Design an enzyme around this catalytic site. Sequence first.
Site, PDB file in Angstrom:
ATOM      1  N   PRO A  39       0.801  -1.229   0.000  1.00 21.19           N
ATOM      2  CA  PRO A  39       0.000   0.000   0.000  1.00 21.19           C
ATOM      3  C   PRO A  39       0.834   1.280   0.000  1.00 21.19           C
ATOM      4  O   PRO A  39       1.931   1.316   0.560  1.00 21.19           O
ATOM      5  CB  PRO A  39      -0.803  -0.095   1.307  1.00 21.19           C
ATOM      6  CG  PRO A  39       0.048  -0.978   2.197  1.00 21.19           C
ATOM      7  CD  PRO A  39       0.649  -1.994   1.249  1.00 21.19           C
ATOM      8  N   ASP A  40       0.262   2.338  -0.581  1.00 23.43           N
ATOM      9  CA  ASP A  40       1.006   3.532  -0.946  1.00 23.43           C
ATOM     10  C   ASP A  40       0.962   4.587   0.166  1.00 23.43           C
ATOM     11  O   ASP A  40       2.013   5.005   0.650  1.00 23.43           O
ATOM     12  CB  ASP A  40       0.562   4.041  -2.319  1.00 23.43           C
ATOM     13  CG  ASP A  40       1.497   5.075  -2.915  1.00 23.43           C
ATOM     14  OD1 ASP A  40       1.870   6.015  -2.181  1.00 23.43           O
ATOM     15  OD2 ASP A  40       1.847   4.930  -4.109  1.00 23.43           O
ATOM     16  N   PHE A  41      -0.248   5.043   0.523  1.00 26.27           N
ATOM     17  CA  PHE A  41      -0.493   6.036   1.566  1.00 26.27           C
ATOM     18  C   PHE A  41      -0.092   7.447   1.130  1.00 26.27           C
ATOM     19  O   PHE A  41      -0.220   8.390   1.912  1.00 26.27           O
ATOM     20  CB  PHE A  41       0.172   5.681   2.903  1.00 26.27           C
ATOM     21  CG  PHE A  41      -0.170   4.326   3.469  1.00 26.27           C
ATOM     22  CD1 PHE A  41      -1.472   4.007   3.830  1.00 26.27           C
ATOM     23  CD2 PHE A  41       0.821   3.372   3.663  1.00 26.27           C
ATOM     24  CE1 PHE A  41      -1.779   2.756   4.350  1.00 26.27           C
ATOM     25  CE2 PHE A  41       0.515   2.122   4.181  1.00 26.27           C
ATOM     26  CZ  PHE A  41      -0.785   1.816   4.525  1.00 26.27           C
ATOM     27  N   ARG A  42       0.405   7.592  -0.106  1.00 29.81           N
ATOM     28  CA  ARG A  42       0.640   8.908  -0.680  1.00 29.81           C
ATOM     29  C   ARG A  42      -0.691   9.649  -0.758  1.00 29.81           C
ATOM     30  O   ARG A  42      -0.771  10.826  -0.406  1.00 29.81           O
ATOM     31  CB  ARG A  42       1.252   8.812  -2.084  1.00 29.81           C
ATOM     32  CG  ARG A  42       2.764   8.994  -2.143  1.00 29.81           C
ATOM     33  CD  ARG A  42       3.346   9.096  -3.549  1.00 29.81           C
ATOM     34  NE  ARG A  42       3.265   7.859  -4.323  1.00 29.81           N
ATOM     35  CZ  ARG A  42       3.902   7.616  -5.474  1.00 29.81           C
ATOM     36  NH1 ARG A  42       4.701   8.523  -6.017  1.00 29.81           N
ATOM     37  NH2 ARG A  42       3.741   6.449  -6.075  1.00 29.81           N
ATOM     38  N   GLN A 106      12.649   5.220   0.619  1.00 33.25           N
ATOM     39  CA  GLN A 106      11.637   5.699   1.555  1.00 33.25           C
ATOM     40  C   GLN A 106      10.795   4.527   2.074  1.00 33.25           C
ATOM     41  O   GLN A 106       9.954   4.722   2.947  1.00 33.25           O
ATOM     42  CB  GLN A 106      10.693   6.714   0.895  1.00 33.25           C
ATOM     43  CG  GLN A 106      11.369   7.989   0.402  1.00 33.25           C
ATOM     44  CD  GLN A 106      10.387   8.949  -0.226  1.00 33.25           C
ATOM     45  OE1 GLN A 106       9.206   9.006   0.124  1.00 33.25           O
ATOM     46  NE2 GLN A 106      10.876   9.726  -1.172  1.00 33.25           N
ATOM     47  N   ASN A 107      11.011   3.323   1.528  1.00 33.09           N
ATOM     48  CA  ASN A 107      10.095   2.208   1.755  1.00 33.09           C
ATOM     49  C   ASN A 107      10.529   1.402   2.978  1.00 33.09           C
ATOM     50  O   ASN A 107      11.714   1.376   3.287  1.00 33.09           O
ATOM     51  CB  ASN A 107       9.972   1.299   0.528  1.00 33.09           C
ATOM     52  CG  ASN A 107       9.435   2.033  -0.684  1.00 33.09           C
ATOM     53  OD1 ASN A 107       8.957   3.152  -0.564  1.00 33.09           O
ATOM     54  ND2 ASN A 107       9.510   1.411  -1.847  1.00 33.09           N
ATOM     55  N   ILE A 108       9.573   0.694   3.605  1.00 31.90           N
ATOM     56  CA  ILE A 108       9.821  -0.055   4.831  1.00 31.90           C
ATOM     57  C   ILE A 108       9.525  -1.545   4.634  1.00 31.90           C
ATOM     58  O   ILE A 108       9.533  -2.306   5.603  1.00 31.90           O
ATOM     59  CB  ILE A 108       9.029   0.538   6.023  1.00 31.90           C
ATOM     60  CG1 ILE A 108       7.548   0.762   5.701  1.00 31.90           C
ATOM     61  CG2 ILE A 108       9.672   1.817   6.541  1.00 31.90           C
ATOM     62  CD1 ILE A 108       6.697  -0.486   5.711  1.00 31.90           C
ATOM     63  N   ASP A 109       9.282  -1.952   3.379  1.00 36.14           N
ATOM     64  CA  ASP A 109       8.734  -3.259   3.039  1.00 36.14           C
ATOM     65  C   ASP A 109       9.811  -4.337   2.919  1.00 36.14           C
ATOM     66  O   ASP A 109       9.475  -5.506   2.747  1.00 36.14           O
ATOM     67  CB  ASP A 109       7.868  -3.194   1.775  1.00 36.14           C
ATOM     68  CG  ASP A 109       8.550  -2.531   0.584  1.00 36.14           C
ATOM     69  OD1 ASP A 109       9.710  -2.884   0.283  1.00 36.14           O
ATOM     70  OD2 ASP A 109       7.914  -1.669  -0.038  1.00 36.14           O
ATOM     71  N   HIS A 126      13.688   5.582   6.059  1.00 33.97           N
ATOM     72  CA  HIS A 126      12.506   5.653   6.911  1.00 33.97           C
ATOM     73  C   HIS A 126      12.405   4.411   7.793  1.00 33.97           C
ATOM     74  O   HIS A 126      11.321   4.092   8.281  1.00 33.97           O
ATOM     75  CB  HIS A 126      11.249   5.864   6.054  1.00 33.97           C
ATOM     76  CG  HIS A 126      11.188   7.208   5.412  1.00 33.97           C
ATOM     77  ND1 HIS A 126      10.354   7.478   4.344  1.00 33.97           N
ATOM     78  CD2 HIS A 126      11.845   8.357   5.687  1.00 33.97           C
ATOM     79  CE1 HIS A 126      10.500   8.738   3.987  1.00 33.97           C
ATOM     80  NE2 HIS A 126      11.425   9.295   4.782  1.00 33.97           N
ATOM     81  N   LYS A 224       4.585   8.433 -11.527  1.00 37.19           N
ATOM     82  CA  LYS A 224       3.228   8.679 -12.004  1.00 37.19           C
ATOM     83  C   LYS A 224       2.982  10.169 -12.233  1.00 37.19           C
ATOM     84  O   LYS A 224       2.138  10.538 -13.044  1.00 37.19           O
ATOM     85  CB  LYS A 224       2.184   8.030 -11.087  1.00 37.19           C
ATOM     86  CG  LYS A 224       2.222   8.412  -9.611  1.00 37.19           C
ATOM     87  CD  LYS A 224       1.053   7.835  -8.827  1.00 37.19           C
ATOM     88  CE  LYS A 224       0.835   8.500  -7.484  1.00 37.19           C
ATOM     89  NZ  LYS A 224       0.689   9.971  -7.613  1.00 37.19           N
ATOM     90  N   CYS A 246       6.278   2.580 -12.469  1.00 36.01           N
ATOM     91  CA  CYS A 246       7.697   2.272 -12.353  1.00 36.01           C
ATOM     92  C   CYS A 246       8.087   1.006 -13.117  1.00 36.01           C
ATOM     93  O   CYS A 246       9.127   1.001 -13.765  1.00 36.01           O
ATOM     94  CB  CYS A 246       8.154   2.181 -10.900  1.00 36.01           C
ATOM     95  SG  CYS A 246       8.087   3.781 -10.047  1.00 36.01           S
TER      96      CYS A 246
HETATM   97  C1  LIG Z   1       7.436   7.622   6.155  1.00 37.54           C
HETATM   98  S1  LIG Z   1       7.097   8.522   4.915  1.00 37.54           S
HETATM   99  N1  LIG Z   1       7.315   6.310   5.981  1.00 37.54           N
HETATM  100  C2  LIG Z   1       7.936   5.343   6.851  1.00 37.54           C
HETATM  101  C3  LIG Z   1       6.888   4.353   7.330  1.00 37.54           C
HETATM  102  C4  LIG Z   1       6.482   4.686   8.760  1.00 37.54           C
HETATM  103  C5  LIG Z   1       5.327   5.668   8.866  1.00 37.54           C
HETATM  104  C6  LIG Z   1       4.018   5.144   8.283  1.00 37.54           C
HETATM  105  C7  LIG Z   1       3.521   3.842   8.907  1.00 37.54           C
HETATM  106  C8  LIG Z   1       2.847   2.992   7.831  1.00 37.54           C
HETATM  107  C9  LIG Z   1       1.754   2.088   8.397  1.00 37.54           C
HETATM  108  C10 LIG Z   1       2.150   0.616   8.284  1.00 37.54           C
HETATM  109  C11 LIG Z   1       1.231  -0.176   7.350  1.00 37.54           C
HETATM  110  C12 LIG Z   1       1.525  -1.673   7.431  1.00 37.54           C
HETATM  111  C13 LIG Z   1       1.978  -2.268   6.111  1.00 37.54           C
END
Ligand SMILES: *C(=S)NCCCCCCCCCCCC
Length: 277
Positions: A39-42, A106-109, A126, A224, A246
Amino acid sequence: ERLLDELTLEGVARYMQSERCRRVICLVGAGISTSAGIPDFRSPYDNLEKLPYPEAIFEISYFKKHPEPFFALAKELYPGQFKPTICHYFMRLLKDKGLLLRCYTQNIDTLERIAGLEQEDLVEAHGTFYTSHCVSASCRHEYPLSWMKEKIFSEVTPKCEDCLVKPDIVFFGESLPARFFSCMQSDFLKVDLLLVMGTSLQVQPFASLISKAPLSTPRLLINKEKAGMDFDSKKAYRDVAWLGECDQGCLALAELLGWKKELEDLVRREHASIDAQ
Ligand SMILES: *C(=S)NCCCCCCCCCCCC
Ligand SMILES: [Zn+2]
């Protein structure tokens, strides 16, 4: 100077093929992961309806007080698989070809790691989910992904067995990892190309990285939307924007470089291998 022969994907490809292009830095965001199902959250909402303000699910203070929302969403939105994208594997190719100086994400995945980028190749700007830490400053017990993953869907708050256990992600209002500042100090002094993919450069201080490169360094955005960069002025000389998804952009670049079959070959086995597990 002006190094690109043309302000287009094709001109960028020709530059990349030349002897001049020796060190590449990638700056990447949510868009590189969206075809992996992350998921994006942008730009989301209805699902969250059950928080004092929407963004506080991503906020440090609220998290310490009320951790379960975040952990509930983490269960809800947890991918059933982790298949890095064409875009991740394009960066893998840059690594194999001795071109990749650093990937700032920037991703945490954790998808960069899975695609075979090593710790030394990466700046997880991040933070990450790969590892989680007890908040207790005198303790800071470390737990792996599998412990955090298993805890999350059990809908129980993760707690330290010696002492809250947070994933090593940088929440809004949290300062960035030391490694971001130390790498940024030297990485941009001698870089030949910036590849900016899947980010609109909306979050700071990550966005400021683009200005760190020498004035002559070309910069390609694959995103995009358009997002210090001068694509369109009468003085444009080095910045190119390719608008679209991308995976399709990296595919077009790979195709121009003569890496199309190679990229395809890499993705096929890496995916089919992940499947077997
Ligand atoms: C900052 S722009 N991004 C780093 C990620 C930490 C802040 C947002 C939390 C995202 C919610 C987790 C969803 C579970 C997949
Ligand atoms: Zn602890």
